């Protein structure tokens, strides 16, 4: 209870100290990237830390609009797709867009451009930069078409953020990122990280949530706290590969489900940070035990399916988290 | 006494599928022949219809927006709402020196419209069989003028986050003579107004379920209908010649700012809510002060625009209506 705000205090102090040096490089990369006719409309999506415990690790996403796409779902995976349709003809491999070819010149253009003042050296997160500062550059195809049919009954936020917001969110473009599946080397996975940022910073039922003292939720604090919890446990057992396949996308997804089941702002009063976090920890454990964690936008996709993560990893993380929660979280 | 009001709302809602469908075929064709002329190439329709008179469902009004990239405005004679257009372009044919001619562009707009039909800010009125008013609007994706810096004060009602979203949207300029001065453009935020009306609650789920049914949208229609009815009952008296639905809509935006909580607009208290609406509007009429919601230093009820006799005439009329359970309904 009081220890959590202690943890939240030492986390916020890591933001008073490099993101300018990040902008100086990515703005130089984007210029020469726009010179190539294949990456003409390239631009930034939203710096963003995927790891809360790594304030020197940044993550960017370079978007590129592909006009008039038609997708083909790869073997009922509901998340991975082929790209049919043109300044991308050089990257064709038949009538599909080769995720391998298009990403190869992307790596090459970056490698050529970073040599003139950095050591770009590394899937979808194709290139990582070393500046004692890290940024990972992801290439994303933008499609202003309607969302795929696998996302029809996803983003169920009507009782929390309203249906007209859901309608407006679904009018936004969606993004595709080169992810291999099973590998099949030319598949692209859907991505709504732009929608997720819209949800976290516009998170209340009331429009004035977290804008005044009487309406101060504790959502963002709960997500930071369980994000930091997994990042810590991944570091404690890093040299043992137990928690290798768990990432922040899991805890962020479990957070979105808790936001829907607890739609009212009154259920997130900052006075109850302890119980709120304890309820967040419980739901995530319930997904570990029942081996079921739907993708928040693609509900037919189980992030915790037996094909992606084994039962032994879930049981181990369960034992770790349960031990932390019973001992006032010593890993913090 | 809300029994009569809900009867009026019942009759206004029972009013129109074939009307708008006839307009959509004509407006779409006009926008295509316009798109051929080099001057009006990037022209689209803003707010992709709007009944300026809530009681006249056979009359629509569209806003043909035209993207103007190079914009450097010159505020005219401290009006803070009328401006001159400088270009810091295909509209070169309509320049009067450095000033973009609202006169030459109008006569241009007048001409090409009348060609494809083979009546005269609302540049043209067309008559289908139902009439539609078409206005031309320059769109500027630049930051809003400094006269709007202290306007749109919704931070305690819709949140400051929403205010920042709104101000990042483009603003629109329409031709409007000012005094007259023949080549001025007036500011326009009707796109922002529409956003506020259909997204009116402090809660994002307002009027979306039985628990959160408000009466904001009901009070504005009743207010608009009250003015339009008194304007017809005294159309020959010529005293209400200058009162329009924009005055009612502006005053409604002030009472939403003044009453930001959704619980203050419950649908059970429609009676008191409408009574509190008309009282603020009468208070504006007596004190002769009604700030523009976006341009706060612009008084819509200044003595230079409307004379004191007109405000007192309308004041006595609304009070006589409010004192006798609104017989004009
Ligand atoms: C940013 C992002 N977007 C998605 C995503 C989108 C749709 C469906 C499943 C998805 N799963 C994951 N992560 N799953 C992992 O195990 C991480 C390692 C990896 O994927 O290589 N992410 N991460
Ligand atoms: C759609 C719209 N936009 C504005 C507007 C914008 C900025 C400043 C003043 C403004 N005044 C008005 N209405 N004025 C009247 O009601 C009198 C008659 C008239 O002005 O023609 N409107 N109406
Ligand atoms: Zn909040
Ligand atoms: Zn409402």
Write up this protein.
Two copies of one chain form a homodimer. In chain A, helix 2 packs across helix 3, helix 6 packs across helix 8 and helix 7 packs across helix 8. By secondary structure, chain A is of the alpha+beta class. The longest helix of chain A is centred in the last third of the chain and has 18 residues. In chain A, strands 1, 2, 3, 4, 5, 6, 7 and 8 form an eight-stranded mixed sheet that branches. In chain A, a hairpin with a 3-residue loop joins strand 5 and strand 6. Chain A is 38% helix and 14% strand. Chain A folds into two domains: 181 residues, Poly(a)-polymerase, middle domain; 151 residues, Beta Polymerase, domain 2, CATH 3.30.460.90. In chain A, 32% of the residues are buried. Chain A is built from nine helices and eight strands. Chain A is globular, with a radius of gyration of 21 Å. At the A-B interface, helix 4 of A face helix 4 of B. One zinc ion (ZN) binds next to loops of chain B. Chain A: GO terms for molecular function: 2',3'-cyclic GMP-AMP synthase activity; ATP binding; chromatin binding; DNA binding; double-stranded DNA binding; GTP binding; metal ion binding; molecular condensate scaffold activity. Chain A: It is found in: Nucleus; Chromosome; Cell membrane; Cytoplasm, Cytosol. Chain A: It catalyses: GTP + ATP = 2',3'-cGAMP + 2 diphosphate; GTP + ATP = pppGp(2'-5')A + diphosphate; pppGp(2'-5')A = 2',3'-cGAMP + diphosphate.
Please outline what is shown here.
With 332 residues, chain A is α+β, with helices and mostly antiparallel strands. The first copy, chain A, contains 9 helices and 8 strands. Bound molecules: the ligand Cc1nc2c3ccccc3nc(NNC(=O)CCC(=O)O)n2n1 (2 copies) and zinc ion (ZN) (2 copies).
